[PDB]
Amino acid sequence: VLSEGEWQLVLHVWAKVEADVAGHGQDILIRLFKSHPETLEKYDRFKHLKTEAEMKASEDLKKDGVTVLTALGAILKKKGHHEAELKPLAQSHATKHKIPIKYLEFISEAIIHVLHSRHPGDFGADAQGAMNKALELFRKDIAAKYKELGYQG
Numbered sequence: 001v002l003s004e005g006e007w008q009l010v011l012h013v014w015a016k017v018e019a020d021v022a023g024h025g026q027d028i029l030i031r032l033f034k035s036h037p038e039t040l041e042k043y044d045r046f047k048h049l050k051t052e053a054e055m056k057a058s059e060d061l062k063k064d065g066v067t068v069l070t071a072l073g074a075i076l077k078k079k080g081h082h083e084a085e086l087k088p089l090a091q092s093h094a095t096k097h098k099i100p101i102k103y104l105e106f107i108s109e110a111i112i113h114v115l116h117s118r119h120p121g122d123f124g125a126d127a128q129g130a131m132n133k134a135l136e137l138f139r140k141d142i143a144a145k146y147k148e149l150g151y152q153g
């Protein structure tokens with residue numbers, strides 16, 4: 001459970017993301033795919049994209065990045081009180097998309113990289129630590145759900 005201060009650092013940098021949710025989403029998904037190319041394979045929709053420029057030009061990828069960040073933003077705003085938001089996400093990601101926790105780690109890493117790249121002044125050690133805790137909590141709670149649904153374990 002994060003402190004209120006930590007939550008406020010998370011939400012402070014997130015407001016920056018909200019200024020251009022699509023461009024942030026693009027940067028994060030591109031980062032994910034560059035750093036962990038195996039992930040691009042569960043997006044049957046994108047899995048054919050080969051260059052950075054192709055990724056930037058893809059409407060579908062741009063849409064997807066907004067979908068991810070919109071959901072995650074709503075989650076972070078709940079300050080850990082996010083059971084109702086995680087429920088449908090766990091369902092689809094455990095039972096349909098089959099996204100292992102390690103991939104959620106990979107996308108967490110990409111979020112952290114992009115937020116530090118674009119907003120370093122709002123993403124010092126203090127804020128990085130808070131975001132890391134928030135994303136860890138999301139992972140921890142979604143993993144418990146996954147198991148309830150019969151995934152992983």
Ligand code: HEM
Nearest residue numbers: 039042043045067068071072088089092097099103104107
């Ligand atoms: C912060 C992490 C994530 C959030 C908040 C998130 C959220 C979403 C939401 C809201 C949707 C659409 C509704 C639904 O199907 O549940 C979705 C779809 C999907 N997501 Fe995620 N997601 C994340 C991580 C991932 C990761 C890491 C992968 C793969 C490596 C992934 C792959 C999938 C796929 C394949 C779809 C369906 C896309 C399509 O229609 O072509 N997600 N996600």
